[PDB]
């Protein structure tokens, strides 16, 4: 669960970061993205200090 979604989100984020000039970037857009950076993002699996943080929307 929540495996394909995180990979897709990381891929989209990397594609947007490495291609700022492009207007619309999607998961199918043939644009450069570093797969090692996506692996590093998934490797942040080890989050130990946040679930939702009560009293704030997202901090």
Partner 1 sequence: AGECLVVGDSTPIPSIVKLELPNPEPRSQSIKFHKKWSESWRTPSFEEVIMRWRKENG
Binding footprint of partner 1 on the chain (CB under 8 A): 21-24, 29
Which of 11, 41 has the CB closer to partner 1?
11
CB of 14 to partner 1, least distance (A): 17
CB of 22 to partner 1, least distance (A): 4
DSSP-derived secondary structure for 6-54: HHHHHHHHHHHHH--S-S---TT------HHHHHHHHHTT---S-S--T
Which of 26, 36 has the CB closer to partner 1?
26
């Amino acid at each position: 669960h929540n495996q394909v979604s995180q990979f897709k989100r990381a891929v989209v984020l990397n594609k947007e970061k490495y291609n700022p000039e492009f207007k619309k970037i999607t998961y199918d857009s043939p644009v450069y993205f570093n797969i090692n950076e996506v692996f590093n993002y998934i490797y942040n699996l080890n989050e130990e200090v946040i679930n939702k943080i009560e009293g704030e929307p997202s901090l």
